[PDB]
Amino acid sequence: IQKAIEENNNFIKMAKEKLAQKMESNKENREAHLAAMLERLQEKDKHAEEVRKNKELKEEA
Amino acid sequence: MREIVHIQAGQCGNQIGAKFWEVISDEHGIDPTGSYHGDSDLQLERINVYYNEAAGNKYVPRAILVDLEPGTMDSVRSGPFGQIFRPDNFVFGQSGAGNNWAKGHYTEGAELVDSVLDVVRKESESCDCLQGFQLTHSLGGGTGSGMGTLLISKIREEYPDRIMNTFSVVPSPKVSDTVVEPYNATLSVHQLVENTDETYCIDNEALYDICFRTLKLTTPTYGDLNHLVSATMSGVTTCLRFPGQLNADLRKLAVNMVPFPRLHFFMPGFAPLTSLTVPELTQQMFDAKNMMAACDPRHGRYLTVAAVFRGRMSMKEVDEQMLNVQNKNSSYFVEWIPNNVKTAVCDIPPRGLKMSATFIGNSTAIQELFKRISEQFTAMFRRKAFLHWYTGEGMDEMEFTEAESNMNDLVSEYQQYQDATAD
Amino acid sequence: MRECISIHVGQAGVQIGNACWELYCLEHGIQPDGQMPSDKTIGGGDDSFNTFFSETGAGKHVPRAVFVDLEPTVIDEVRTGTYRQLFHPEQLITGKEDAANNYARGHYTIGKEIIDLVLDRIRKLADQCTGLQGFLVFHSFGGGTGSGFTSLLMERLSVDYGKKSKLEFSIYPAPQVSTAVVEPYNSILTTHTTLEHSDCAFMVDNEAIYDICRRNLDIERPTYTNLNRLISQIVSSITASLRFDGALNVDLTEFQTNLVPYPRIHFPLATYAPVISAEKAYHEQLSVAEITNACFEPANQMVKCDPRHGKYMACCLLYRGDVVPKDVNAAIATIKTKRSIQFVDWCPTGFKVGINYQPPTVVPGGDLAKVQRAVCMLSNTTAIAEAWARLDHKFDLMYAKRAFVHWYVGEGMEEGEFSEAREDMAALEKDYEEVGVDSV
Ligand SMILES: Nc1nc2c(ncn2[C@@H]2O[C@H](COP(=O)(O)OP(=O)(O)OP(=O)(O)O)[C@@H](O)[C@H]2O)c(=O)[nH]1
Ligand SMILES: Nc1nc2c(ncn2[C@@H]2O[C@H](COP(=O)(O)OP(=O)(O)OP(=O)(O)O)[C@@H](O)[C@H]2O)c(=O)[nH]1
Ligand SMILES: COc1cccc(-c2cc(NCc3ccc4[nH]ccc4c3)nc(N)n2)c1
Ligand SMILES: [Ca+2]
Ligand SMILES: [Ca+2]
Ligand SMILES: [Cl-]
Ligand SMILES: [Mg+2]
Ligand SMILES: [Mg+2]
């Protein structure tokens, strides 16, 4: 009976951990995807501010 | 509860957008004043998708009207259904863009974009559960092309987890004399390859060939071309606007149609094209002559396809005929995506047609269109023609090279999956 | 005592639950308002039907069920439909945006926001039970919610209710009604994730149900209402042992002992008869022998596969209605002498039989004829692996090109979960092959 309790508890333990593991890795992965998406768009805005600044130097000619 | 926010930018964008709202307003029973005068409650079950319900049982399009020239803003305001749009949702500049992508994307459009995002933001906050955005615009001009892609990038910034789709009118010499359209189109595609989930390629070359050859209309006008566009856009949006037994939202439809993120450029199709039996409609809707993109589907392979039928017909016969076309044309469907053809049926047909069919195809033959644009592009870029218009706004010339290479990459990617095999 | 909690997940689960509980109410004489005039024990009792229904002091009989979906349109039809009064509002749970046929959204992105609420509402039902037996989970393989959220729920139920039993009713995708290219992906992902958490799963192939409706009911193009009403009959026959009692009634658990030799081999094949239209049924009453023979015609199976080209590990017959053992034993004898029924060498060839005397009921205005006797056969045959094989093949075709995989990766999943799940299916297909080999 002690063994039976031991197995039921371990099955619950392994399940609780593996689930928590999966849904921490998934949170990390989705955040890393959107973080890269925004950083790409923010890098676009730099090139946009640079294009505006390059027009401003030649109109001073 | 699944609201869509509509945006129309530029000359072309605002006209085909008006046609869209005219057609679906009639289908939903909405008059130019916003009052419902319908016979069936099915018109209203999904009215919220495109309309806000205001005080007084008035329905107001969830649309914003944008342009860098004020001319079109009055034209829209005076046409049929002019006063039903929210007046403060009209956003204007003074100068214009003169068919220059740089002006719409970097200088003049950037000046006005923030005020546009303000009206977008206030419309979205009043949505019970926003599903995404749709944009109507051309790629050959300056405002719809340049500023349209800029607006998409800014919306993708604030709403990165919402679907962004576009109805993009592709330029053609057969309809426009302006010469720098290949530049604007290539620059627009470079943005659309990255920042859209679905792009319906409405090709003016195909619309002309249809109006001239099939419809027998010598000297076609923009009104003739857009009448085809409104019929297509109405058919494409029928899946969301009417309560079929399809419980699909923009994301679910994109998930079923886009096997790879960059290959989201669709060939629209419509049938019949005249001014009919289910087998004839199905055979016509898969014909190259009925496609809104100047491409032959028999020159490529289908990654995914969606057929929408409208009218009262035998659902058994539709299933049999759809299976017939697949069986008899199995060579033109990739074998590594099983059951890649979807079918929807709406009991409600469009105005003045007992039966119609709308076709949405993700075919590798779309490369023919991009190759055409790439050819016109390189013909000039290797000659450095008219570059002063763009470098005068701050652009470097490799930015043209990057966009060109990205489109040639897109074409080659379509070719890779066209040549791919299962075993 | 020995209560069962039904959980209906996603569109398929909810709509099938609608048909099942509608049928239960008719079989037990429960009205749409929850009143049951024949129950004289007000507000409680230990009757057999109390395993699926609780009682209120006002005399209402409330299903021990929870309906869950990540979008509200389907459960909204329940909240305003004929049986709205049956369920307490807290039993109907809805999100606002669905899983868009994406397992990741149902398991991770969107499921994450509502899982705790669901478990708390399920806990409120369990606390009302004196001797809870287990759970009945209804869901589809193809839907993003039916696959992803169900997996999350099953994982969380194993934690909150240890090894308390959990049974599945799973909708296997069929192209005739499956409107989603990615349903093979979701199917393998969810089968892999729930395998360790399910004690017994009854798979229903929509193509099989589709053909049965077309062939035996002469419905040119069946609808989900046609399919579900038929599915309810199979579900009712399986659960009739728990809701009714008698001297020949065998508990489903006793059948389950025979049907699961190995924990992984817990997918019984269900066959049902008779499915007959009222036009045919007139002046043609079927005998015990006739319906029993139908149980071995593959055209009546819930899953398309060939038992003739596999081996049996168990054969259970659940009769309901006007049936007595004598006629059953006679029919079984004739069938044994005429049909291809080969058992594995390591299990006995006998047939376990149970009988319910309460006759079958049909929904008003349906297509099924009311019959005096019916039977559902539950068999553990290796042939069921054919369903895994077809599904795994479609998975391999798309995954070799990583088609549509970006939709899952975008929601936080890793390619490794795909290959991990596919490998589990490869082992499962190999396990079925192993069990069928002869000993040495
Ligand atoms: N079918 C159709 N095409 C149109 C219509 N109006 C403009 N176009 C297309 O629009 C393209 C040129 O772009 P513009 O009309 O200038 O629109 P835009 O992008 O806003 O450019 P600007 O406003 O001038 O800066 C051409 O290729 C035309 O074919 C129309 O009413 N119908
Ligand atoms: N038998 C049966 N199957 C159904 C029914 N409704 C949907 N399905 C199946 O479900 C799949 C489509 O996915 P859904 O059920 O809509 O997905 P969901 O579980 O509601 O969750 P989502 O992905 O958010 O839509 C298809 O394979 C259908 O065969 C039904 O009423 N009866
Ligand atoms: C750009 O804004 C919008 C607005 C409204 C609708 C759409 C739209 C429609 C559509 N219609 C046919 C279709 C395709 C896949 C399907 N899967 C199951 C049924 C089914 C039906 N397909 C897509 N992809 N988008 C896009
Ligand atoms: Ca013209
Ligand atoms: Ca009682
Ligand atoms: Cl998204
Ligand atoms: Mg203009
Ligand atoms: Mg759903």
Number of strands of chain B: 12
Small-molecule binders here are:
guanosine-5'-triphosphate, ligand USI, calcium ion, chloride ion, magnesium ion
CATH-level-4 superfamily name of the largest domain in chain B: Tubulin/FtsZ, GTPase domain
CATH fold annotation of the largest domain in chain C: Rossmann fold
Keywords:
part of a larger assembly; 3 chains; A: 61 residues; mainly alpha; B: 423 residues; alpha/beta; Rossmann fold; 60s Ribosomal Protein L30, Chain: A; Helix Hairpins; 3 domains; two-stranded antiparallel sheet; 43% helix; binds guanosine-5'-triphosphate; binds the ligand COc1cccc(-c2cc(NCc3ccc4[nH]ccc4c3)nc(N)n2)c1; binds calcium ion; binds chloride ion; cell cycle; Microtubule; Stathmin-4; Tubulin beta chain; Tubulin alpha-1B chain
What does this structure look like?
- Chain C: This is Tubulin alpha-1B chain.
- Chain C: One of its GO terms (biological process) is mitotic cell cycle.
- Chain C: It catalyses: GTP + H2O = GDP + phosphate + H(+).
- Chain C: It is found in: Cytoplasm, Cytoskeleton.
- This is part of a larger assembly, with chains A (61 residues), B (423 residues) and C (440 residues).
- In chain A, 93% of the residues lie in helices and 0% in strands.
- Chain A is mainly α.
- Chain B is an alpha/beta fold.
- Chain B folds into three domains: 259 residues, Rossmann fold; 106 residues, 60s Ribosomal Protein L30, Chain: A (2-Layer Sandwich); 58 residues, Helix Hairpins.
- Chain B has 13 helices and twelve strands.
- In chain B, the strands form two sheets. Chain B has a ten-stranded mixed sheet with strand order 5-4-1-6-7-8-9-12-10-11, sandwiched between helices.
- In chain B, strand 4, helix 2 and strand 5 form a beta-alpha-beta unit.
- In chain B, helix 1 packs across helix 7, helix 4 packs parallel to helix 5 and helix 9 crosses helix 10.
- In chain C, the strands form three sheets. Chain C has a six-stranded parallel sheet with strand order 5-4-1-6-7-8, sandwiched between helices. Chain C has a four-stranded mixed sheet with strand order 9-12-10-11. In chain C, strands 2-3 form a two-stranded antiparallel ribbon.
- The longest helix of chain C has 22 residues.
- The relative contact order of chain C is 0.12.
- Classes of the chains: A mainly alpha (61), B alpha/beta (423), C alpha/beta (440).
- The site of one magnesium ion has 7 residues of chain C, from helix 1.
